[PDB]
Amino acid sequence: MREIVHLQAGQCGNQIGAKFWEVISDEHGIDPTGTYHGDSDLQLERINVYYNEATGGKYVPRAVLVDLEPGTMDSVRSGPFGQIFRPDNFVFGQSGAGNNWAKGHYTEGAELVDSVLDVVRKEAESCDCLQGFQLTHSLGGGTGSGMGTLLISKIREEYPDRIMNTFSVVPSPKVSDTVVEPYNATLSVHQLVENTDETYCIDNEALYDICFRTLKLTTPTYGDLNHLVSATMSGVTTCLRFPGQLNADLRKLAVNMVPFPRLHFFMPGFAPLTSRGSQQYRALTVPELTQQMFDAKNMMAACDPRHGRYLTVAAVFRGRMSMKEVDEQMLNVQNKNSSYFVEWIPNNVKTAVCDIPPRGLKMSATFIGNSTAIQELFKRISEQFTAMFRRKAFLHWYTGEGMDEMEFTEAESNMNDLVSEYQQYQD
Amino acid sequence: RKVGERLEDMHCWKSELQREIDELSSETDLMMAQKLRLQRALDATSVPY
Amino acid sequence: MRECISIHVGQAGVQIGNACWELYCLEHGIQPDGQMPSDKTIGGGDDSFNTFFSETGAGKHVPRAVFVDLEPTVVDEVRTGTYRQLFHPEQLITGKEDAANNYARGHYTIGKEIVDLVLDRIRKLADLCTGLQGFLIFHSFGGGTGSGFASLLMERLSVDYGKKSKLEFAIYPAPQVSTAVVEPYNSILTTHTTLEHSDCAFMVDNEAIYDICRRNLDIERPTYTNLNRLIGQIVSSITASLRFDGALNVDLTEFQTNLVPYPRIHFPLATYAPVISAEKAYHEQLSVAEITNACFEPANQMVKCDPRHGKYMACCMLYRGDVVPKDVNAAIATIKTKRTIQFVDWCPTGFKVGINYQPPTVVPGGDLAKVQRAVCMLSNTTAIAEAWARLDHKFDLMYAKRAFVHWYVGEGMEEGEFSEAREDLAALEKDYEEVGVD
Amino acid sequence: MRECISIHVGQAGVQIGNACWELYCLEHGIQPDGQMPSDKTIGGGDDSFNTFFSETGAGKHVPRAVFVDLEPTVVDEVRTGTYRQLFHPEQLITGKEDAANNYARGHYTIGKEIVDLVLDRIRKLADLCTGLQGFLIFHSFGGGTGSGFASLLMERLSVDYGKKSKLEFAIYPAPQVSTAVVEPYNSILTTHTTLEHSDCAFMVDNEAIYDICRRNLDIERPTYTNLNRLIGQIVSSITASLRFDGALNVDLTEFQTNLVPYPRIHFPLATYAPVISAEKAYHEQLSVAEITNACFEPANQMVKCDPRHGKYMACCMLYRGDVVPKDVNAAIATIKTKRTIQFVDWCPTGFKVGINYQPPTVVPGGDLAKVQRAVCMLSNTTAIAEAWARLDHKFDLMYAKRAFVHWYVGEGMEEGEFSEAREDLAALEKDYEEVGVD
Amino acid sequence: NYSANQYEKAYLPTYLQNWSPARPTKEKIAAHEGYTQIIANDRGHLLPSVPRSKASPWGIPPAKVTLTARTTTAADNLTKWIHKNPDLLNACNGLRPEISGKPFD
Amino acid sequence: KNFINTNAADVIMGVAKKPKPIYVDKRTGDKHDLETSGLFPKYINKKDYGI
Amino acid sequence: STKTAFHRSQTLNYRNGYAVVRRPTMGIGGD
Amino acid sequence: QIRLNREHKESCEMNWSDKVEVYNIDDTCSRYTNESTQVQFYPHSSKFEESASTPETWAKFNHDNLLRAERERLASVNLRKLIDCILRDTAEDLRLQCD
Amino acid sequence: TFPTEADRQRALKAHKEEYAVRQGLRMGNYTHP
């Protein structure tokens, strides 16, 4: 069959993969130790999409974790699920990274690309057919961009017929912690939009707004943030692993979503959130599902798409529903606002229906969307870049490493041209 | 004609009886297995005492 | 003798075939095991079933169908369902990848390799066949994958056998609902690469199905269960000619000869009259007059083309149940006299009557009422061109600025085909106005 | 009476000789003790077994076979194994050394000192032989050692006797699979040293034996056990004419005449249609028309050749079980009427037909079905050019580099043999081709 | 390859269930003469002088149609869109579709 | 940059890629290579055969 | 009008080069 | 719980056996015809006319038995879930105490 | 399809003169009093 090899990089990835994999395991009902116990015969059947079979009926994750700092490895091994990964799958360096994308893109990866490629293509040989890969990292990842750019560029020609989905967290507009972080973003995004097919973008400030708007829980953990994003990724991938009548495949989605080569970016958004009394006050119904489904409050990725226009929307529903209700739902929303949707395309709504519920809640859904509401992010980063660049701030590290200003010039050319691209389409 | 009608009417009940007996047996299997699991857990309990 | 072969492409069509057999088994009383009681009807396969099964001395009925799929999930589910012993173990072809709404992907990239297997299967059933009046192709026009595969298999069978029937049934695109904005592309691709071969095309729409459902059946959240049940009843009705006797008999070849007026335009509409719930039928009455009037009522059709916008060329109706020729002919005469229904000036007689005594059957635990008089209606009228105007003004808009075309041109097609299709359709609309004009 | 001799050379051979006699005791009802049960057929070894044994007043059937091997391993294994009490110790002839993949090693270094014992045992069986119609000689082409040995002993027997039949079986070189880089050498050496004394050589490709073994045998981890039961069933089929009766009966000499047209070429190919499992057969039907179509499906030949690109010169059909000449001739007529099959303009008729009432048997632990109709098809066609073409191009390139020459020259041959082989196969290509020219 | 005689109901695509006609058969031949002299040598190598069919074979736009009435220029184009494909007009089971029809006015 | 026009020109000069003939075998039959299968190839066409 | 099941007995087919006619056993509906 | 389940299994199995034999008997009966064999003079008698049941009563018999089996299955499921939860809680609390 | 170009142009001029009152492709019957 056709399956998936998962890549996780940077300390961002070190959180995300651990949380996301334990989520999937708790879904498909396997103990952290490994021995299975059958309750959903269908979940027993459809397992080769992610898990290769190890004797004793254990199901090794076809995932690979890479970073440069051993302590994060130690933590993700000492967590509640550390036994579930392979001593094989821990490739690593010895030196510290320090968020210097220049070194991360030449000075340490140059000697570990060999090992990482060996292991990943070993898994590729192990399996039969691959959709492609998905990568969990951060573009603001101080090691994330450095490793990701190189490995992506290699795997492009390694398997040029595949689906290399990218899942990244965007640096916070209000605060970047690292001051060379705008440099990291501007440098990574060039190769990103030069290579990618589908890339997600999620911001944590709006997650904190979620914390004070529906979470209402005082003191959240970055682990719980990871829990939210893991639920989103799970939901977008559920269509492949379960029965019920819907179209599942990733590029099945992609051809519908993207209009043109350089369009690659999307926003996720989740479905019913609920405060402590709203559990015993929420009537779980298709209308309110669709309502909050389309909420600027629920919007959490970049900013309110109020200010831009939706090119395309794709929605997945999960549970025991029918279709006439979702049909009347979108019909209602296009008729409520046909102005907001673009005219260059009619019928910009796409739907899918997976019958199998997640564990615990019956009615569920999730979103993916392409809107003209992302100018803000990279425009912001553009002014940040121009400001710090105005008189060669912090530039000596990179000029000692081996970079030079011309590279920065074409990166900023890429960014500004893309801005004009998005605009003059939506205009 | 009357006797044929009677035959079909019997065949119905025969079918449902068979099916329900099958689910009953499966349930017996599951409960037996869980009981054995409980037994071995009781075995495990004693050491820390 | 008398038999026909069913072909199913698409996780779309697997369902509606599944329901068709979920019905077809009950009427001749074949248990889901695949075996009757111990009586004496089995042999070389010679009794009622012989038109859709070849039950040899094995005592096991062979569903004369091929279920092909490219995404193993739903077909594997029917493999693990009840009827697995009924279905023939490698008539259930499964594939590993899909065409992803890309007609050209299905038409070149993956269409080249399953065709050998399907040709194998068709010939090695045709061997034991004797009469083989034709085939029933199940597909869709908004084909996520059923577009290119269906097109290429259809042309291959057209060029390997030329002298028999091809009947086409399809869920048609909605006037204003699209689950894939790639449908306005792939649908016309299918149409203008099938017209030169397709014998008789027929369309039906799920929205209008819903609308009938909540106007008269009082079902507010019906399903695919209900929709496929209705469609299965329709196809069973049109096959009742072979299945059961009657005052007269008609055939699918008669449908072809009597319905399509010209080469090209072969796109009529289908309708089923006595739709009503049991409770609603209970304290009312069904009779020839009102059932015929209702089946010509404009608000009971399953495609959004009001007949008043169009003009009738041909009408075929099959009465299934207990009816009599006296009131049959009286009612049709009254309809001819009725003013609003505007038949074109050509057809003096345009009414293929068909009669059969056999009462239609419910599906156990189904949805429909208990009916002693059904009529299934096929109608060729000019009202169709509205949807084609819809399609062309969608197409020119979203094509002139060349959105999404890069996928197709990369995976292997060019723009000449998309050039030719538009004027194919334009010639179709000029033909429609020319044929309408009197 | 009607009897023949059996010869097996090599670890390559005693394998499937073991398989064949394992089977041959079952269907005739022998216990591995070697004495018949309480019922009575023992005597001077003359009942239906008599064509393959002589159960003399000794009380034990004795296979009329000689197992000659260069290496003690396998012969010791079978001696220590099950059937030794049946077997005759010294006709299990064993040597001390291996030909080490060197054709000339097997033809000169070792052949001189053992062929004497070979021929002596042959004659001391021939004395008691009366009918002695022919032989079943089993060898290979990519032989580890058996190849040159078989060639030379065949030369000895061909020059001492020349008024009988000789049957040749060798697994054909796997097209793209090699267990020897010296395989093209030793193959072609055997070919040009045997082209002029043999009678009828038939091929098979164990890759394809596997390929069917997972196409319809439905196991992804078959074994040699499965392959050997298949081929043993084939030899049982060919000897069924001797073993039993029927409406009409045919013989090996009829084969040798009717199949091959001309000298040189005497290399047709075999096929067996109803290779099917019990689970698959459970709910399907078996009969003449579909078994004929299956046996002529292009991918059911166990050697990589195309009917479509080839052209037929001969076909012999051997039916076993319960059939009638009526539907036999009907099926064969359909075959003639078909178009994909393209007989050469030579043969007006093309079909040697033979029938036996007796259905083949099965074996416990065996994985065939419980079939009621068996057909063995033997065909001669032009579709086998590619095999020798592949062989010659591979050989010519690696002979142009001329490695392993040192091996052969050191052991005492030269290249002139290679030159003769090359010109021989160069002839044989156009030999196959201008006869096809029409 | 030639046909049988008289009993002409039991040998047809009626029982092949063929739907691609078999071959043009016949019962039509005059008394051939000649001793059938020999031009082969030992194998099927024809003697060079005598000719053979010297390896003439060695070893979708098509659609059966009636012109009837489709726009005249489109009919003219359809003629070519059917023909000009000898590959699917020559051999390998012949691979030959038909034509019917009437011109325009 | 009128990238609308640019993408139009791109796709118009898109030409194509070509496919590779690869067949399938069974129920879940793999995409087993076809061209040089040995099973159903086109191999007798080279300027050595016979001579 | 109490007749319910209406199937025909296929008393005619070919099965081989010459067509064949059966012995009528079950009538309208089976009887 | 095991005891009760097995008992009801046995009872329903018994009645199903009964229905199988009666159905097969009538099947063997129905292929009779006027011309055929199995055709005799057997005199009248009241054993032929005896009455033992009526359709609705027999139906309600069957219906009661079915519902009984259904309730017992439901009860079994409930007890199973309860036992599982108790096991989990026991383990966790002893773990915390040891920590 | 019309056997006379004359009938072609005649019926076409009839339709274009009746254009306004029809319904639609502006082809269906206006009906109504």
Ligand SMILES: Nc1nc2c(ncn2[C@@H]2O[C@H](COP(=O)(O)OP(=O)(O)OP(=O)(O)O)[C@@H](O)[C@H]2O)c(=O)[nH]1
């Ligand atoms: N593990 C973890 N990561 C966080 C947390 N909060 C934010 N992050 C983000 O994780 C991102 C980078 O992860 P990595 O790709 O592994 O980073 P790196 O390349 O090793 O170097 P840095 O980006 O400087 O950490 C940072 O940019 C942070 O914004 C958190 O609470 N835990």
Ligand SMILES: Nc1nc2c(ncn2[C@@H]2O[C@H](COP(=O)(O)OP(=O)(O)OP(=O)(O)O)[C@@H](O)[C@H]2O)c(=O)[nH]1
């Ligand atoms: N025949 C049928 N059609 C359905 C059903 N449910 C939805 N549809 C319609 O059928 C169409 C399905 O076509 P596709 O989804 O492209 O199917 P496909 O091309 O074979 O391949 P996929 O995209 O993988 O499903 C949808 O547009 C629906 O509007 C169903 O149960 N039966």
Ligand SMILES: Nc1nc2c(ncn2[C@@H]2O[C@H](COP(=O)(O)OP(=O)(O)OP(=O)(O)O)[C@@H](O)[C@H]2O)c(=O)[nH]1
């Ligand atoms: N007869 C036979 N052949 C086999 C068997 N298994 C594989 N083969 C094929 O048969 C050939 C065996 O030939 P060899 O290995 O050279 O045997 P040999 O020539 O008698 O001498 P050795 O080198 O000692 O084995 C191989 O090329 C295989 O392709 C088997 O069990 N029996």
